């Protein structure tokens, strides 16, 4: 199972407390070891 | 004879719960590389029940 929790807020990480609600579950069944982030460049 | 259905004969490690293996790589019984070809200490893990 792949579970994703999330939280959004309008603001070094800040000092405070905020809990995260569950929003996604995916019945995948995979062996994961590595990952990467995807950007969106601003073309001139 | 029905050769369609197949099972697995060799694997390095035991499967975790609720896991599926679709890899068909040549199992290395020995230490020499198999080079993707059937040979000594190199067997195709998928076998046919027939
Ligand atoms: C998951 O992948 C890693 C990749 O190195 C491997 O070492 C490990 O044996 C794999 N586990 C399962 C349960 O397939």
Coordinates of C-alpha atoms and ligand atoms in Angstrom, one line a residue:
Chain A
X1 CA 0.0 0.0 0.0
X2 CA 1.2 3.5 -0.8
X3 CA -0.2 6.1 1.6
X4 CA 0.2 9.9 1.2
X5 CA -0.6 12.5 3.9
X6 CA -0.3 16.2 3.2
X7 CA -0.8 19.7 4.5
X8 CA -0.6 23.2 2.9
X9 CA 0.0 26.6 4.5
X10 CA 1.0 30.1 3.5
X11 CA 4.1 31.2 5.3
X12 CA 15.0 27.3 7.4
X13 CA 11.8 25.5 8.4
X14 CA 9.5 27.5 10.7
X15 CA 8.9 26.7 14.4
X16 CA 5.3 25.5 15.0
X17 CA 2.9 22.6 15.1
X18 CA 0.5 21.4 12.4
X19 CA -0.8 17.9 11.8
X20 CA -1.2 16.2 8.5
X21 CA -4.4 14.5 7.3
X22 CA -4.5 11.4 5.1
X23 CA -5.6 12.1 1.6
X24 CA -4.3 9.4 -0.8
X25 CA -4.1 5.6 -0.7
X26 CA -2.9 3.5 -3.7
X27 CA -3.0 -0.3 -3.7
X28 CA 0.3 -0.6 -5.7
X29 CA 2.3 -3.5 -4.4
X30 CA 5.8 -2.5 -5.4
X31 CA 9.4 -2.6 -4.1
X32 CA 10.6 1.0 -3.8
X33 CA 14.1 2.0 -2.9
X34 CA 14.8 5.3 -4.6
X35 CA 12.9 8.4 -5.8
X36 CA 13.3 11.8 -7.4
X37 CA 11.7 15.2 -7.6
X38 CA 10.3 16.9 -10.7
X39 CA 10.7 20.6 -11.5
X40 CA 9.1 23.0 -13.9
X41 CA 11.5 25.5 -15.5
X42 CA 10.5 29.0 -16.5
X43 CA 11.6 29.5 -20.1
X44 CA 12.9 33.0 -21.1
Chain B
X1 CA -0.3 -30.7 -23.5
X2 CA -0.9 -27.2 -22.2
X3 CA 2.4 -25.3 -22.1
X4 CA 0.8 -21.9 -21.4
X5 CA 0.9 -21.9 -17.6
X6 CA 4.4 -21.4 -16.1
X7 CA 5.9 -21.2 -12.6
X8 CA 9.1 -20.0 -11.0
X9 CA 11.9 -22.4 -10.0
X10 CA 14.9 -20.3 -8.8
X11 CA 15.1 -17.0 -7.0
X12 CA 17.8 -15.4 -4.8
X13 CA 15.5 -14.2 -2.0
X14 CA 12.1 -15.1 -0.8
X15 CA 9.2 -12.8 -1.8
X16 CA 7.7 -10.3 0.6
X17 CA 4.0 -10.6 1.4
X18 CA 1.7 -9.4 -1.4
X19 CA 4.6 -9.1 -4.0
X20 CA 4.8 -10.1 -7.6
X21 CA 7.9 -10.9 -9.6
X22 CA 7.8 -10.2 -13.4
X23 CA 11.6 -10.3 -13.8
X24 CA 12.8 -12.9 -16.3
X25 CA 16.6 -12.5 -15.8
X26 CA 18.8 -15.6 -16.0
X27 CA 19.4 -17.1 -12.6
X28 CA 23.1 -17.2 -11.7
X29 CA 23.7 -20.5 -9.9
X30 CA 27.5 -20.1 -9.9
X31 CA 29.9 -17.2 -9.9
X32 CA 30.6 -16.7 -13.6
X33 CA 28.2 -14.2 -15.3
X34 CA 25.4 -15.8 -17.4
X35 CA 25.6 -13.1 -20.1
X36 CA 21.9 -13.6 -20.8
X37 CA 22.4 -17.0 -22.3
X38 CA 21.5 -20.5 -21.0
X39 CA 24.5 -22.5 -19.9
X40 CA 26.5 -24.0 -17.0
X41 CA 25.1 -22.8 -13.6
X42 CA 22.7 -20.7 -15.7
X43 CA 19.0 -21.7 -15.9
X44 CA 15.9 -19.9 -16.9
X45 CA 13.9 -19.6 -13.7
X46 CA 10.5 -20.0 -15.5
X47 CA 9.4 -23.6 -16.0
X48 CA 6.3 -25.0 -17.7
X49 CA 3.9 -27.3 -15.8
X50 CA 2.7 -28.9 -19.1
Ligands
LIG1 C1 13.8 -4.7 -3.4 O1 14.8 -4.1 -4.3 C2 16.1 -4.1 -3.7 C3 17.0 -3.4 -4.7 O2 18.4 -3.5 -4.3 C4 16.6 -5.6 -3.5 O3 17.9 -5.6 -2.9 C5 15.6 -6.3 -2.6 O4 15.9 -7.6 -2.4 C6 14.2 -6.2 -3.1 N1 13.2 -6.8 -2.2 C7 12.2 -7.5 -2.6 C8 11.3 -8.0 -1.5 O5 12.0 -7.8 -3.8

